[PDB]
């Protein structure tokens, strides 16, 4: 991340060892469950591309996931280069140059360049964009590692309704379908795959019932 | 949160990555149990509205809970605007303006505005009010996610009395009934739903026995 | 329909009794299956609004379906009136007036008016629009009368794959989901609900396999 | 189709509603069995491309079959354009222009153009060629929808020989193998897959026995 020294200057600060160890635990203990994605977003808060690559080195041990991440990052960098062509001409002395795809990801750039790019009025977030590419890669990995399809999430005969809803929504978050498809799933498949008692109650509740009403009517069933 | 620099000026400090990761773990691992509410109150201690929105982004993955939170926040903001009309007239140069409902929640305000609003003599807490709205939303979510009714909390035939009391009071905290209703529950339903031996002992103890006496008389039963 | 007399003039021709009897058989024998919709479209080919109302009189015996049709027609007529306001001013002697919502459906118009409206260069199809409203109503009825959800269409242990595909697509046509949802269904649910042998083969076939390849690989299984 | 008016002029006549309904019944009730192909050829006798598209609208409900038909028609139109290049130069006033691939199928042409093209001395059949393309598409669909391979057509232990022959030849018509392969099938596989008594009789009959002799020798077996 970026901090301020006693002179009021922006200086890069390395990720603390225990934050890196928390990220390592997340990678090595959660088997790329969907919750890995928010946690990363919390653990890389306000990070620099060098810090993001340091965090990615933990994923580098997982060869398949690391390869998927590298493919996603390369594709995003190519798209960024395509959408941000290198302008030919004079550059203002007070304005910094435009980083390339290999520079925003920190493969070739230096620390001072990223510090200057991130701290500006208005700021151009390179760390945030690299983080978004990382999150895209992580979402792909979570989809790859999902053990069950949403069509296979069925409420158990004695399973409480809240646990079934939690499993259903966790699987839905893992699968990352289209928004309309997700809405159709939450409206139809959740009722369809419930156990007979909750299914009867939800059918009696009618279409268009909110999730709160559904969980209320099935609370102790 | 807000800290003081070497110049004695109030400056916003971002939430540390491990605090955000602790909040992420709370959201993603505790299934909106009642204890999520104190923990949030601990983890957002002295926070700014921007920090509170950063913490809410973790809840944003949970679509139903996020929608309930957004509804509660919008209702609270509308009530705040209704109870705090925008005064038309001159404003003192030394007195800051009054934030609106979309400004206290940090949807439209800036960091410097919130820093100035929170640090004053006397202070007007915007972060605390936003936190209270968040806690209202979280209480609604905990009520929604409660798996069992208080009427269904019954002591097991071999369950120790202290565990039954703990489950009963946890469910009572989840349900959030009216204060008189809660008092009636703790006075009558706790005795009513106990197992036969503890029920006999508590009936012999008589009405109006304190919880300490009840747990004493049933300690090893 | 409309025919030409020996004088070269457009004259309305009534629907033949056996065409009406075919429509009656479709209504009374097919229980509003999806195939009722193409057949109607074939049987009302080039029809006038009076003819369409004559055909609807067969549906009028089915009270619920007739009420749904009347609701759909009234809604479509109201939308047509909203989108086609009655212009105030002179009307060309050679140009016919604009029919209203109650006039295109033939509730108040006469035969000569519809004959003149339909036969023009360029023609303004009133019979076709009324037919489209009828088809909307019929689609609603078919959705209402569908006996099974698409989620409940599962291949039998000894059922041939082509029959399962036919049932699946018939149910999909009955349900009339959104196009993206329909694509998701045909891509995922068809494989998901197949019997174990065909399911194994289709999983080996991989995602993105065309329906022809799927039916080929499962032909005799 | 095309009829003659009282003035001796060729005028297009629309397909009667009951012919269209017969075609709809064929499409929706026969599951693309091989007999759908002769029936279509009977029902579209002397039809125009606009009429053929009207008949295809019934198939348009069957999404996979409609897509296969559209692919076949587009391929045939491309081949027709390749084999019939647009000549650059003068055109005789008494000779009509050459329709393109999108014009013979009636996607862009008009009714009068097709009427003039079809009625000529000598006539250039555009409806017949479009019908042949439709029949190619339908043959592809029938091959796709065939439930059993010809190798899986085996005479039942008590099945009469004529029924086995009928099933065998129906499957052979569905599969549409090469002519030499079809001859090999009818000569060898029919005897190979018969039940033991008929198989013994046919083996005694010898190679090169005609189908009439085979059905005679196995009539009551
Ligand atoms: O979410 P928190 O409540 O802040 O939990 C943390 C977390 O512990 P867990 O993830 O095991 O719950 C830290 O683990 P790290 O991933 O950073 O390693 C751990 O730090 P240690 O690594 O040093 O164990 C720390 O424990 P400590 O209090 O000893 O600093 C502990 O905080 P709490 O103990 O306050 O829960
Ligand atoms: O092959 P055909 O003997 O001429 O059969 C037709 C055919 O009936 P089926 O296909 O049910 O055997 C017609 O059905 P369409 O497909 O044209 O609808 C039907 O006409 P309807 O639709 O009006 O039932 C007509 O019956 P009708 O005699 O009432 O005209 C009937 O002819 P036959 O009754 O002479 O068999």
Author numbering:
A (entry chain A), B (entry chain A), C (entry chain A), D (entry chain A): 1 to 221
What do the paper's sentences say?
The HIV-1 capsid is a fullerene cone made of quasi-equivalent hexamers and pentamers of the viral CA protein. Along the body of the cone, the CA subunits are assembled on a hexagonal lattice, with the CA amino-terminal domain (NTD) making hexameric rings that are linked together by the carboxy-terminal domain (CTD). Twelve CA pentamers occupy sharp points of curvature—termed declinations—exactly 12 of which are required for the capsid to completely close. Here, we identify a Thr-Val-Gly-Gly motif that modulates CA hexamer/pentamer switching by folding into a 310 helix in the pentamer and random coil in the hexamer.
Next, we surmised that the Met66 gate must constitute part of the activation barrier for coil-to-helix switching. Thus, a constitutively open gate (M66A) should also favor pentamers, and indeed the CA-M66A mutant also assembled into T = 1 particles, as did the CA-G60A G61P M66A triple mutant. We solved the cryo-EM structures of these T = 1 capsids to 2.2 Å (CA-G60A G61P), 3.1 Å (CA-M66A), and 2.4 Å (CA-G60A G61P M66A). These confirmed that the mutant pentamers have the same structure as the WT pentamer, with the switch in the 310 helix configuration and the gate in the open configuration. Interestingly, the CA-M66A mutant also failed to assemble in three independent experiments, although the mutation does not directly modify the TVGG switch. This result argues against a simple model wherein the TVGG motif fluctuates between the two states pre-assembly and then gets locked in upon assembly. We speculate that the random coil configuration may be analogous to a restrained spring that is poised to refold but is prevented from doing so by the closed Met66 gate. In accordance with our prediction, the CA-M66A, CA-G60A G61P and CA-G60A G61P M66A T = 1 particles were not stabilized by the FG peptide.
